[PDB]
């Protein structure tokens, strides 16, 4: 079926939970043996969210190459994304090592450091120009260059230096600051505006390594971001845009990381975002 009318048919019939459970039942199951090794317990935020072995990002280290991060490679859309958990106190250096090694231009953050009164990820970037951060375990230096605070999101320019080689690179930090503590946003308009700002920066384009996207577990909000981006790109590329099937795209993405889209409300929000976004792309 088309998307917008499938949408009203699920709303009128109140069957979002049943649609979402079907997706969960049909989703891929692949091994995640490296994630579960005892030496990696303090590298995982949640025991039930792990990268598959076949798609995990490897750190360029011989001691321990593990990080909780996955490469989502979308062949028809010609887009790639790295989805990862919010960094932990003992993985902030690994996080920036990955950004460096994978040649990423942008980092997309969809959570606040504290939500619901608890810490959802480490404070992993510097908050003042004159107070830079040094990650001694991976030999990197990170400096805040500029910051632009808007009503729904903040964009930061960061300088990452590889202290071994003295090479430097400019990284863009895109921080969506207004996702509610509970539920999903009422309107997708600010989320779509944010997606378009990431696109306009070059961070999603083939001349750079994959964008790094995270929330707390790296599967819910993060899944919503890449699912909406890929569906809208496919609607522009195909002769028949009404052939784009958001449930099939989501199942393809779940071949590369488990659990993408965590609730039926996130599934409905993803439909809403793609539907509204497809009208703005043209008019
Ligand atoms: O009939 C439809 O459902 C339909 C869906 C998407 C669409 N596009 C137009 C071209 C790029 C943006 C969305 C056109 C038609």
């Amino acid at each position: 079926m088309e998307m917008e009318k499938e949408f009203e048919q699920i709303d009128k019939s109140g069957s979002w939970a049943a649609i979402y459970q079907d997706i969960r039942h049909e989703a891929s199951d692949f091994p995640s043996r490296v994630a579960k090794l005892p030496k990696n317990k303090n590298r995982n935020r949640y025991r039930d969210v792990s990268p598959f072995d076949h798609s995990r990002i490897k750190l360029h280290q011989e001691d321990n190459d593990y990080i909780n991060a996955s490469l989502i490679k979308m062949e028809e859309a010609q887009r790639s994304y790295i989805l990862t958990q919010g960094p932990l106190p003992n993985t902030v250096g690994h996080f920036w090592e990955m950004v460096w090694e994978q040649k990423s231009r942008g980092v997309v953050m969809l959570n606040r450091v504290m939500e619901k009164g608890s810490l959802k990820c480490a404070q992993y970037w510097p908050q003042k120009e004159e107070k830079e951060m040094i990650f001694e375990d991976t030999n990197l230096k990170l400096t805040l260059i500029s910051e632009d605070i808007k009503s729904y999101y903040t964009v930061r320019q960061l300088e990452l230096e590889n202290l071994t080689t003295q090479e430097t690179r400019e990284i863009l930090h895109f921080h969506y600051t207004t996702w509610p503590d509970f539920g999903v946003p009422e309107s997708p308009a600010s989320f779509l505006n944010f997606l378009f700002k990431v696109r306009e920066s070059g961070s999603l384009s083939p001349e750079h390594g994959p964008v790094v996207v995270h929330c707390s577990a790296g599967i819910g909000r993060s899944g919503t971001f890449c699912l909406a981006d890929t569906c809208l790109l496919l609607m522009d590329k195909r002769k028949d845009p009404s052939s784009v099937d958001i449930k099939k795209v989501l199942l393809e993405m779940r071949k590369f990381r488990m659990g993408l889209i965590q609730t039926a409300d996130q599934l409905r929000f993803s439909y809403l975002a793609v539907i509204e976004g497809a009208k703005f792309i043209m008019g």
Side-chain angles (χ1 to χ4, degrees):
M1 196 185 316
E2 174 192 60
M3 191 169 30
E4 172 145 38
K5 290 185 284 154
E6 190 199 348
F7 179 85
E8 321 222 49
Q9 198 241 323
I10 301 170
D11 258 8
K12 74 170 169 50
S13 54
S15 46
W16 282 108
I19 301 301
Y20 178 66
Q21 259 304 138
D22 298 350
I23 287 163
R24 291 188 60 161
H25 179 71
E26 287 297 326
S28 303
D29 192 22
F30 292 114
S32 309
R33 285 167 210 130
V34 179
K36 303 308 281 172
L37 297 172
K39 66 175 175 162
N40 290 326
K41 196 157 181 180
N42 78 343
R43 291 181 184 216
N44 295 310
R45 184 176 286 284
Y46 304 105
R47 56 152 178 71
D48 59 333
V49 180
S50 301
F52 299 140
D53 296 318
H54 78 88
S55 54
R56 74 184 182 95
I57 299 295
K58 297 178 188 185
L59 306 173
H60 299 178
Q61 223 256 97
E62 38 193 28
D63 170 52
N64 190 341
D65 71 6
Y66 178 75
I67 181 170
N68 193 318
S70 308
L71 179 65
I72 301 4
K73 188 172 186 194
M74 301 306 288
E75 185 170 26
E76 185 189 357
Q78 285 294 289
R79 278 271 223 258
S80 294
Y81 318 85
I82 293 167
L83 269 64
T84 191
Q85 69 186 14
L88 290 156
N90 61 296
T91 70
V92 173
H94 306 150
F95 179 89
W96 287 114
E97 175 184 2
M98 177 175 65
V99 169
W100 182 268
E101 286 166 358
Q102 303 298 315
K103 302 180 156 56
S104 308
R105 179 84 190 292
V107 172
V108 173
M109 173 170 182
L110 305 171
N111 66 289
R112 293 167 301 279
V113 165
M114 179 165 285
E115 299 182 7
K116 297 179 183 183
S118 304
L119 292 174
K120 296 297 168 195
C121 88
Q123 181 61 51
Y124 66 86
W125 72 94
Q127 294 178 283
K128 295 179 183 303
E129 288 86 340
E130 68 276 13
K131 294 278 205 192
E132 76 274 14
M133 290 177 80
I134 294 174
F135 305 101
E136 296 185 342
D137 60 339
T138 55
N139 216 30
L140 291 157
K141 177 176 105 172
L142 183 65
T143 306
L144 176 67
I145 299 302
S146 74
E147 179 168 67
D148 191 356
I149 302 172
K150 306 276 225 301
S151 50
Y152 290 92
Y153 69 99
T154 299
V155 190
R156 307 181 178 91
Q157 299 182 302
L158 308 172
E159 181 201 67
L160 188 61
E161 183 179 347
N162 176 350
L163 293 173
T164 300
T165 67
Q166 293 193 326
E167 308 169 283
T168 66
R169 279 176 214 159
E170 181 186 325
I171 309 299
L172 302 179
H173 194 243
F174 286 92
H175 189 181
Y176 190 81
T177 54
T178 51
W179 194 295
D181 270 12
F182 290 95
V184 305
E186 184 159 298
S187 162
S190 59
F191 192 68
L192 286 165
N193 187 60
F194 174 77
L195 167 62
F196 298 157
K197 297 294 186 186
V198 180
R199 278 184 176 197
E200 289 177 5
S201 79
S203 288
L204 290 164
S205 298
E207 63 251 23
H208 300 295
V211 70
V212 172
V213 353
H214 79 88
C215 48
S216 191
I219 61 174
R221 299 173 200 176
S222 291
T224 300
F225 184 88
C226 59
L227 180 62
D229 184 52
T230 283
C231 285
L232 291 168
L233 211 51
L234 292 169
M235 290 175 82
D236 270 348
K237 214 171 203 255
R238 286 186 186 177
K239 289 184 180 184
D240 177 11
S242 73
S243 72
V244 174
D245 187 334
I246 179 167
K247 300 189 260 48
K248 286 176 177 168
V249 176
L250 178 55
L251 287 165
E252 178 66 26
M253 292 184 162
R254 278 194 180 216
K255 297 177 181 174
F256 301 92
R257 188 170 175 82
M258 63 170 67
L260 304 181
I261 307 300
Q262 283 177 291
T263 69
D265 258 37
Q266 280 176 4
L267 185 64
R268 181 180 186 275
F269 181 75
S270 300
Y271 274 75
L272 267 184
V274 175
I275 291 169
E276 187 60 26
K279 309 167 154 158
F280 199 74
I281 206 123
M282 315 183 172

